[PDB]
Amino acid sequence: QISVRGLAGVENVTELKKNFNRHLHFTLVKDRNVATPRDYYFALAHTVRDHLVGRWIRTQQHYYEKDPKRIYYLSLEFYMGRTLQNTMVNLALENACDEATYQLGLDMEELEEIEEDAGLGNGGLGRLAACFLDSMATLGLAAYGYGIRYEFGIFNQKICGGWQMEEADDWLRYGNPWEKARPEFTLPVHFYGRVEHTSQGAKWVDTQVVLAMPYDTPVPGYRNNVVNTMRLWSAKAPNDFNLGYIQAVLDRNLAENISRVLYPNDNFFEGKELRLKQEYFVVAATLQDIIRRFKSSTNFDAFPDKVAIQLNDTHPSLAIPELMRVLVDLERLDWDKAWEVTVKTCAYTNHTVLPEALERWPVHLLETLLPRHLQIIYEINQRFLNRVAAAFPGDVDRLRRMSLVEEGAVKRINMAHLCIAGSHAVNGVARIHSEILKKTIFKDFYELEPHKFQNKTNGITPRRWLVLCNPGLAEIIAERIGEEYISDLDQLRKLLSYVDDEAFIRDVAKVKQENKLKFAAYLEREYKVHINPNSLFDVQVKRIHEYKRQLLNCLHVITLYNRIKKEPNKFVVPRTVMIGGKAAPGYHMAKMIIKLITAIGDVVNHDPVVGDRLRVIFLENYRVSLAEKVIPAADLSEQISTAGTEASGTGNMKFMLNGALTIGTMDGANVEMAEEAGEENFFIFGMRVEDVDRLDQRGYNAQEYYDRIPELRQIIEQLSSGFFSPKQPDLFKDIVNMLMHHDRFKVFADYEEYVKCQERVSALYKNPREWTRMVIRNIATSGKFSSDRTIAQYAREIWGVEPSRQRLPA
Amino acid sequence: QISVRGLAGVENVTELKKNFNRHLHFTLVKDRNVATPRDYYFALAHTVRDHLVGRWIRTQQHYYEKDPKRIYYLSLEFYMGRTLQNTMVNLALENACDEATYQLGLDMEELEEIEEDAGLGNGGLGRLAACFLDSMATLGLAAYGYGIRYEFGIFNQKICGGWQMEEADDWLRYGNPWEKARPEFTLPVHFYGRVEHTSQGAKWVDTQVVLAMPYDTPVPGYRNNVVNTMRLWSAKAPNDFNLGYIQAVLDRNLAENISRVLYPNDNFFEGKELRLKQEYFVVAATLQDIIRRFKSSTNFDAFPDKVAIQLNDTHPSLAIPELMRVLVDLERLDWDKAWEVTVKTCAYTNHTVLPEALERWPVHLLETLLPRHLQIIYEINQRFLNRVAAAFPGDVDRLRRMSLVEEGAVKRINMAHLCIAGSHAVNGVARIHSEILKKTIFKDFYELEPHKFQNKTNGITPRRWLVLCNPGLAEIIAERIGEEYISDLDQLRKLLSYVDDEAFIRDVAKVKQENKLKFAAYLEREYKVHINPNSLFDVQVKRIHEYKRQLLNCLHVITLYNRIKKEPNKFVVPRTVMIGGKAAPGYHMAKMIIKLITAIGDVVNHDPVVGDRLRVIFLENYRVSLAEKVIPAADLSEQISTAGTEASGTGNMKFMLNGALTIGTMDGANVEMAEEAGEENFFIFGMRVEDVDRLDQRGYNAQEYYDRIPELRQIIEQLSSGFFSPKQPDLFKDIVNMLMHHDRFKVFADYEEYVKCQERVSALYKNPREWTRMVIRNIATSGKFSSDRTIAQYAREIWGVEPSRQRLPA
């Protein structure tokens, strides 16, 4: 059908058809009379993955032969989504499989909807890891993703009576064709026990053993025949475990609970023992695998030349004392040499500045669970603090501020301080975020070691986030500038010379309209909801948090509603306002916000006077597969975090690439996006970081805004009186209370300027040609935000390796 | 190499080789440089199972077309063992695969040793189910085995310091190639709740739901292209289960524990709730599957013409009230019609007379777990007791004796009484066992309904138990009489005309010697134990129980030892005495017996005066795969249960078929074996059932034997004084106490006659030619004990179906 999806040759289609039927028969044990769509999906999945094996075996063979420096990306989250379409794309098989399935009498898109998301992450941090793996393979890097194979990923969100309900994400129910169990590489991990001191150093004894069983998943590069590995560990009890008899067998569950479920808290910290076990489990198993592979290349001086370990936030921070443990206790290196090796091997990426999101483990937990690691941490702290003392003599408060050990009610280890001490590089994820680290939360560490601190602005993969999810847009671009931009996104700049091209303008606008039509149909079919596809699609999708200010969006929505009821026969640009995202199960306020959104929809969507001019939809169960649908259909991207709170954002980049305009604050990567497109092509509003600081010194008084803005006053009184909750009049008292008295994120302070800026959006949308030309200027400048650029920067400035766009032989 | 293993054609070997390499590459993701023997086994397993698919799909297709009466064999145990070699045999692929693997540079026998036993049973009852499935497929019956997919089967037995240790049998660790998950046929099973009465009958409400997920395993007939199904249910939690959040996900384990582990008690009863849940789980899921299949053929009158349900002991006895429940409550049939349907559908096989092995469930358990089923049981009891009252007016004690409800300390349901009431046929498993049922434990029921009571003498499959495990013997037989006996074992009679054939005698004796050489080498290699292959192989293998009298064997061993120390320079026929079997984890006495055996070995095997004339070996971890090795190597089969206690035995039949002679009592199937071979060709000793009865009336006094047999006295005093336990002098006080004062099984009463009869064994073994001629007379008469005969009798006399040896098209 379309060019970018590859060739549909005669021998290929024929071969795919026969292998499809082979798998349906031999692998699935079905015939065409009993098979359901699910069987058909599986036959296809097996037919496609067969094409990976040769490339996978020789890629791994190649790294053994050439022995390059290895990159290990350690994360507790890999938010992969679906794998079938992504594999076809990177292997140039999409059109061939479309044809083969068509000829078999099947619709391939229908089959793709059957695959479950691999939802092994929460949000931005997890999806970043997924985009990164794709870019690392596309760039020919010898990279491995290491993590945990959670039996249950992020929960499926059901909305019941306007309230979020959680249900288990049993994603392995039907089996996962995209994994290969490797029980032969099972490794032991130790917990509890005690430390014995002898003539020849410390020994960790009387431990409980849990087994780590690896599952390998292939990561194909873009049309370069490179297939990298993501290795996920699963927890297994050893066979003498607890070994009245029945109970001993049943208690095996305890050990295997380590890998059972993903913790659904993002940007918040909970000191639970099970979570600490997960963190150590992944670190301990991964490091033995690393060392094993290194020895199969005595001399650990060369270790940092052959190994890089990237820590995705502080979650795998135990890698630092664990590497020390192995080097000191098991390999018998002296402390100083072990430490030199550790520091040069490790690097740390920070993903937030929110205080409550920082990991500070109680000392008594580490004491019981990991007694040797606590000892090593104390020793690291001592030697680090002596360095501080020597650089800043007499500065006693600096010493307590920089200590890895935090004194107080309970003693805690600050895992972020550990990471900075034990890494040769520390980076933030957007320029403003990286500067904030140097100036505020890690100021003391920056003064001690300025050379460690870097920026690596986030990116998204243009394969999943353009080619895969928006084929129409990828095709009209390809027609004009060719296909090379897919793995070199800077080439999109060449589209600037098409901003006055009338055919292109018409094509860009047509692609959007078709995406909107397709999505409006999806909503009617799978969710029985009616929307006007002519309206402006105003979308905010991301995890529910107070700092992301879904509430500010709510206030705007209520303003438009109130203005309509005021002047019903006045003209307004119609909108479909879509908000989606999951709330963390214990986050009460976030759950109330979801309830508010649905409650506004109940009033707005059934007011006859409004008509189809305003619609408020809550998008249930937001996740990667839903993002791939809603993002290409959006006109307006809401990126309205309070300045200084969103480290980067990546959602923002997805919308930019897919032809939506952005309303947002000067926060995280928004700053760099506006800088790339030109501020005139962006809807910037609200306080900058400096304005926020000024307001804090002075003291934020919400009352002041309530007193001076009558439209804001009206909204508050409607919330309070029960306008949006007639049966439960005081349902939203908590939200009003928080807004009026306890608002950390200054919702009222940006209200006026936000509503105003939203009027300017409406104004531009009235002029289709001028809307579309600004869109073209956004897409054309989105090249910087490809994760290929990000990864090339990591490679050169942190890991010390050269990316390569060269093909491996097929 | 040998004829019975099929043809090794040029196109077959070539095709097998290429499919092997395809699987190693595409399925296992390996090349020949990284593959281990385990990978090679898996490539082979996949290559072989590919040959089943076509036959499996068309067999099942055929039953849908022709719609024959369906047989459902319900068991909580299926002791399958290994599957690779059995599949090759039934598909005539053995020689072809041997050649293909040889040419690939691999030894197939080495690869076969890699497969784990499917140990989903305890002993005789579980192995009977496995032999039965094989015979049902070989005989063209539309039969299904239904059971539970235990995650952990029977434990692996380790011997430590002479003591049994148990470890988890993690048989699914590397994955099972012989199963196909069928998550699309998942069914709900209900527990707990309460009964509501309405205008339109009772309703079972407020239940907890557990999901049952089926796994299908293929059961290939012998060279007839028939492939039947064994469907095993796995327990899964529903997705809203318990749905703080983390714990709700972790508590899913509770539901899934239902299918976690096989209960390791045989011939003993433990009233544990988890065991009751297993029994209902398999029954409830199986019956919905049965009814579903029946409706896909309103009119339940035809139900018994299209369905037979065989209950393997009382473990799936809940099928009776469950069928009633569905018919009465859900389909709205009247009680009397529902009951008529139930009775004509069900049949019950009894496997023991030991009182402590009978299932008697406390009423309060059924009350809480299955409230509706208790109600139905009471109603069944009432209507049954009215029938008894009417047939035997005024006989009030008969009424309490026959009641399904047992009064006392706790009220119990006698599940055996339930089975007899709700089945059209009740059968024992050997002629003497079936007579004992009619005369003693079920006498009252036999008087009420004599027509229900039948015999079905047990059998063993000659495929696994001759062709597979003893190819050498199968070949020398085939040379003389052809191959047709494999599926018609009565043909072995033709061997009688070869009893004076000098070539045959030499061949029979040679096969045995090679089996003994092979096994003696196995012991040295895998267990570092040295034995003389020239000695008589005296073997007792079976689960450890007091009724099986491993202790009597022990006493004989000690007698031989003491006689040697008495007259060291006298000649005695050398023996290797091998005893093996697992003890139930909570059975203290059985564990002491194992300890005794090893303790005798410690003394005997290191006495220089004994030399290699006497050796006592405990065979660790006895199981199906070990049986396939030790049985063809045995000269003497020990079948020495106290008369009236072993319902049938099947081990006995295995030894008969493979060229060992039998020392045993007139118990279970021994009676019929001796009858077939002629009593002169059997070593019969000891009390018959009648003698046991006489002794009980009189009162068994062990002291009397101790007083009058000096050799017995010596043994007891050695046990007591600490001769066999120097460091722990009183270690065996319990055993001596039990023998002297509390022996239910009258070990002393058979001692004299046993020792005497053992002298006669030694005498015959001194004459190789005459030993071998008697052996030939045993093998030649073992035809009756094929499970093909047993199953044909079930088919005609219970199920009402005709067996067929006709081939399905290939």
Ligand SMILES: OC[C@H]1O[C@@H](NC(=S)N/N=C/c2cccc(Br)c2)[C@H](O)[C@@H](O)[C@@H]1O
């Ligand atoms: O879903 C069924 C099962 O599939 C198995 N895969 C097996 S046998 N071969 N894969 C081969 C293969 C080939 C290419 C790519 C990948 Br990616 C895997 C996995 O080991 C199981 O964990 C899984 O449950």
Ligand SMILES: OC[C@H]1O[C@@H](NC(=S)N/N=C/c2cccc(Br)c2)[C@H](O)[C@@H](O)[C@@H]1O
């Ligand atoms: O860099 C990628 C993205 O990372 C996100 N960080 C996230 S999801 N941290 N989660 C932290 C977290 C997760 C689980 C538990 C705990 Br305790 C903290 C940032 O908020 C985005 O601005 C950024 O674009």
Ligand SMILES: OC[C@H]1O[C@@H](NC(=S)N/N=C/c2cccc(Br)c2)[C@H](O)[C@@H](O)[C@@H]1O
């Ligand atoms: O061991 C790996 C996995 O294999 C799978 N088998 C699959 S995908 N095809 N089988 C096809 C097939 C064909 C012929 C016979 C049989 Br018998 C199965 C099972 O569903 C899993 O439970 C198991 O863990």
Ligand SMILES: OC[C@H]1O[C@@H](NC(=S)N/N=C/c2cccc(Br)c2)[C@H](O)[C@@H](O)[C@@H]1O
């Ligand atoms: O018919 C086959 C064989 O069956 C055996 N019965 C067995 S294993 N019953 N197990 C009963 C049992 C099992 C588990 C729990 C409980 Br509570 C009882 C007989 O003992 C043999 O004589 C006979 O040859």
